[PDB]
Write an enzyme that holds these catalytic residues in place. Structure first.
Site, short mmCIF file in Angstrom:
data_model
loop_
_atom_site.label_atom_id
_atom_site.label_comp_id
_atom_site.label_asym_id
_atom_site.label_seq_id
_atom_site.Cartn_x
_atom_site.Cartn_y
_atom_site.Cartn_z
N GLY A 102 2.26 6.04 10.01
CA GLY A 102 3.78 6.28 9.22
C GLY A 102 4.43 4.86 9.88
N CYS B 177 2.84 2.02 9.40
CA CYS B 177 3.23 0.95 8.13
C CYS B 177 4.67 0.51 8.03
CB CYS B 177 2.56 0.85 6.95
SG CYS B 177 0.41 1.45 7.62
N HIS C 120 0.84 -1.39 0.45
CA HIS C 120 0.29 0.22 -0.37
C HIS C 120 0.85 0.99 0.25
CE1 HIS C 120 -0.29 -0.17 4.95
NE2 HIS C 120 0.36 1.47 4.13
N1 LIG Z 1 -3.35 -2.55 4.74
C1 LIG Z 1 -3.10 -1.38 5.07
C2 LIG Z 1 -4.31 -0.11 4.90
C3 LIG Z 1 -5.28 0.07 4.21
C4 LIG Z 1 -6.29 1.04 4.68
C5 LIG Z 1 -5.40 2.31 5.60
C6 LIG Z 1 -4.46 1.83 5.56
C7 LIG Z 1 -3.67 2.97 6.77
C8 LIG Z 1 -3.30 2.10 8.26
O1 LIG Z 1 -4.02 1.56 9.12
N2 LIG Z 1 -2.32 3.52 9.87
C9 LIG Z 1 -2.21 3.05 10.25
C10 LIG Z 1 -2.65 3.39 11.20
C11 LIG Z 1 -2.20 4.09 12.51
C12 LIG Z 1 -1.83 2.50 12.91
N3 LIG Z 1 -1.78 1.89 12.27
C13 LIG Z 1 -1.85 2.33 10.57
C14 LIG Z 1 -3.56 0.75 5.29
#
Ligand SMILES: N#Cc1cccc(CC(=O)Nc2cccnc2)c1
Ligand SMILES: N#Cc1cccc(CC(=O)Nc2cccnc2)c1
Lengths: 304, 304
Positions: A143, A145, A41
């Site tokens: 951030g 991820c 992603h």
């Molecule tokens: N695969 C995937 C995915 C799909 C939609 C949206 C996102 C963005 C997301 O979840 N960020 C995030 C925030 C906070 C903590 N961990 C992560 C990721």
């Protein structure tokens, strides 16, 4: 003396963290040998996340569109491919700090350490468990991820998790290092609900053994039970069923303390039915389930 | 999303851990520049520990009696001196992995990460707090002495603790890196009792702010209080008195959430008086006090 929620030393994994940017998205990558692994992603805009077609989005990307930075130096991307939900970016330089490593897919109830990162820089390390509903209860902001989960066996790092998503309930979902999600989750900005977060029974029993080894014995009772009787109570309290495989795994703890596994089960049964009554076990007012039997043995014996 | 007990990444400290042996005693040392720091009780036999005269015991030791091993290679000891309860062993080689560092003496209530080691090898990392009675609740076995506590500010490691002892109650005592014990403890095999382990009020309030930021809001009430009224209740529950300095330090959390510090104090007052009623806050059934206000800001903002 003492029992702490302990993570593996993170240095071996710190030497692998890089920053991956594609367009306006920046997340973390894991650099092992000449490959950088990151969530696929990274190629998406927030709009693309509503209903992404990753194969189609990837056609508009070339090697030069992926910016990989290790410290304050840029790595040259010479290839890119998608494997399930992860991108593998081949770089022209093998990571000189690559530790001995393996990619493993863990089972629910298994624990691992997480090195939380932002912009390819480590901010913290914590211990967690793969929940029985295939979520993790982490601490991740936007951030984070690409931050990874791992276990270490002397000098070999077994990578088991890569962070991808935060569900609308604030629990986390991710993949193994082959890009396959744990559980039924998908990398899409669509509401995905998690199943029942049941308690990892074998881990709670391991932690009750750790409490006895460390002097907390108030909860030990004069009763015993059977696997079938215990499991009727476990079902009622949303605890995972205990199997003979779990009893076998608790054998070394039973041997060290002289408390038969079924006797510890009967103590747990009374704790479930009567509550703690304002008391604590190992400084906790609830039954902890994020220590496996192997973790209890390792911490109580000092495995380095 | 999520809030975890998080430790600093340990790599910078892993590169400093060495094994120090004197006679039949082996413990950990910290190698920074050309000096190895370790507990002075490395020179003692278990018999010497009953009533040691360290200056006298040290006269029978020469540089060649201290064996320092970094990985699988031996360091040459060219000098040795005692500073309070630590020994400083000058070696002929500066540690090539010495990070930027400082030695700091922390106040009670302050948190730090511990890299638990055995035979100069790291086994785990966990987060803890200097208790108001100057003990720490760690996880240390025999051989863990010389393991260190630290905080990291971007690239500078501030070393604040070195493990020395386990009290008969299983709580831990140690020194700063100048060898001065925290609290009234001495490096002697004599029964030493710890004082009241009161709760670090400002840390509990910081953690209640972290819970509100993460969605756990059930405990927020319609009341407010004053510092004097709150402190009468805090005294009754063995909580540390809250001062205007603590209120000032909670300012950024109050600003982020829109909850005045005294209103959060009133919520805490009701939690103390009514209990949790079987409920949890941030997955805990008791009020957590090992997160400082700075830790909550750092974790909630993603400081790397
Ligand atoms: N695969 C995937 C995915 C799909 C939609 C949206 C996102 C963005 C997301 O979840 N960020 C995030 C925030 C906070 C903590 N961990 C992560 C990721
Ligand atoms: N200063 C000091 C000192 C005095 C007496 C005895 C000892 C040995 C001791 O306490 N080891 C130990 C075991 C377990 C955990 N942490 C540490 C140390």
């Amino acid at each position: 003396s003492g029992f702490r929620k302990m993570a593996f030393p993170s240095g071996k994994v710190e030497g692998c963290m890089v920053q991956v940017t594609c367009g306006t998205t920046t997340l973390n990558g894991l650099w092992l040998d000449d490959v950088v692994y990151c969530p696929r992603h990274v190629i998406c805009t927030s709009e693309d996340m509503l209903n992404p077609n990753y194969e189609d989005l990837l056609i508009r990307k070339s090697n030069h569109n992926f910016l990989v930075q290790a410290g304050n130096v840029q790595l040259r991307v010479i290839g890119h491919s998608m494997q399930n939900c992860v991108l593998k970016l081949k770089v022209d330089t093998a990571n000189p700090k690559t530790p001995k490593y393996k990619f493993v897919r863990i089972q629910p109830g298994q624990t691992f350490s997480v090195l939380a990162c932002y912009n390819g820089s480590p901010s913290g390390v914590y211990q967690c468990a793969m929940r029985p509903n295939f979520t993790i209860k982490g601490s991740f902001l936007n951030g984070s991820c690409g931050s990874v989960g791992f276990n270490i066996d002397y000098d070999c790092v077994s990578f088991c998790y890569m962070h991808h998503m935060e569900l609308p309930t604030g629990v986390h979902a991710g993949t193994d290092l082959e890009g396959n999600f744990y559980g039924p989750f998908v990398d899409r900005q669509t509401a995905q609900a998690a199943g029942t977060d049941t308690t990892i029974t074998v881990n709670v029993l391991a932690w009750l053994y750790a409490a006895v080894i460390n002097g907390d014995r108030w909860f030990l009772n004069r009763f015993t039970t059977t696997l079938n009787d215990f499991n009727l109570v476990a079902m009622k309290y949303n605890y995972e069923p205990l199997t003979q495989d779990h009893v076998d795994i608790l054998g070394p703890l039973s041997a060290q303390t002289g408390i038969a596994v079924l006797d510890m089960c009967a103590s747990l049964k009374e704790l479930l039915q009567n509550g703690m009554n304002g008391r604590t076990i190992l400084g906790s007012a609830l039954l902890e389930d994020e220590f496996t039997p192997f973790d209890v043995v390792r911490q109580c014996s000092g495995v380095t």
